[PDB]
């Protein structure tokens, strides 16, 4: 059994194993870091089954849960939030915070999302690039989702820049473990204080809603509110940063499609849909353990065996998406959903917010900077390490 996670084939490409497995062995066994074996599911139809089967569990203290690193094994000890829950506990807690992320709520947020993107673009303009390229990640891709989710949670404007840097330090590949855990503690301590404050005078933010509607009535206590706030911050922020940077790099690689976006910004929604299919930047979140024996394709998965469902592979599934390895914002879409945001009950709570952010970015960025160019040769883009989810560490641009 091959070791898993697989490495990406190159900077921007998924692992090569997935295409071979989809063709010859779509439900296979892989070896995890601790020597345990898990089942790996690679086809779109089987990923959807894994994501919805009531015979499968996300509870991480069940025997056989497929942890991918040693830190995940000890993270499993903590009291769980809804990301790690099965029905009916899952939707009991998830529903406490879902109101902010509904399509209607996200529509109402659209002026604020646009103003955030406008302000940060204008800041970048004023900084200019007269002394060399600027890092689109540091200057733009990192603060845009950070400022928005921090603001929704309830962080005041003056604290945004410090907390944005601390969260970036958490996931920066060159941070030492001491730097990353210090940044982590800094975030948790800040959130505990903000929870104490909002318990005394609620405002109009997510933490206030949790304090007023759940903590004070005693449905949860204040430490649960901190953990839930923390989950909403760290679950998707690094992914959002990567998607923004990957969209710029991808457009630099497909000049003809960038030219269409420049001439018709209203193509931004379709560009975003294809971006999220092609660059599946969160590819290791659909994990389960079997509560009962379950048959997947031609394989029997026994109770207490772990399953990893690759939505990355599913998003390149030839049986669903014609020419899946071509980036084509003008593709015709089949009836089946792309799985960039997962599937089923656990499907990303922030799918609509994330797409609204991405759509706002790519309908605005080239109207503001029509001559935006990646400043280094495209073969020299600093992608995330090949053993990690696809992403971009820094992206020098001029404009
Ligand atoms: C492009 C941006 C993003 C992508 C590609 C993405 C992707 C995903 C994926 C693949 C999952 C697993 C879903 C499943 O189990 O089927 C997920 C879950 C989740 N994501 Fe996102 N995400 C993004 C942005 C965000 C943001 C901005 C937030 C929070 C503000 C967020 C919060 C969550 C949470 C809380 C879950 C767990 C949901 C549950 O189990 O009920 N994500 N996301």
From Swiss-Prot:
Binding of heme occurs at 348
The catalytic activity of this protein is classed by the Enzyme Commission as: 1.7.1.14
Q: According to the UniProt record, what happens if one changes residue 71 to G? A: Improves the NADPH-dependent activity
Cysteine pairings via disulfide bonds: none
Q: What is the effect of changing residue 73 to A?
A: Decreases the NADPH-dependent activity
Note how its activity is modulated: Cyanide, CO, and oxygen strongly inhibit catalytic activity.
Could you tell me what reaction this enzyme catalyses? nitrous oxide + NADP(+) + H2O = 2 nitric oxide + NADPH + H(+); nitrous oxide + NAD(+) + H2O = 2 nitric oxide + NADH + H(+)
Q: What induces it?
A: By nitrate/nitrite.
What keywords would UniProt list here? Acetylation, Heme, Iron, Metal-binding, Monooxygenase, NAD, NADP, Oxidoreductase
Q: What is the effect of changing residue 71 to A?
A: Decreases the NADPH-dependent activity
Q: Which domain of life is it from?
A: Eukaryota
Mutagenesis or variant effect for residue 74 to A: Decreases the NADPH-dependent activity
Q: Name one GO molecular function term.
A: heme binding
Region of interest called Disordered, as start-end residue ranges on this chain:
1-17
Required cofactor names: heme
Q: Report the sequence similarity comment from the record.
A: Belongs to the cytochrome P450 family.
Function statement: Nitric oxide reductase which is involved in a dissimilatory reduction of nitrite. Acts as a nitric oxide reductase. Is able to reduce nitrate and nitrite to a gaseous form of N(2)O when oxygen supply is limited or discontinued. May function as a detoxification mechanism.
Report the protein name in the record: NADP nitrous oxide-forming nitric oxide reductase
- Which species does the entry assign this protein to? Fusarium oxysporum (Fusarium vascular wilt)
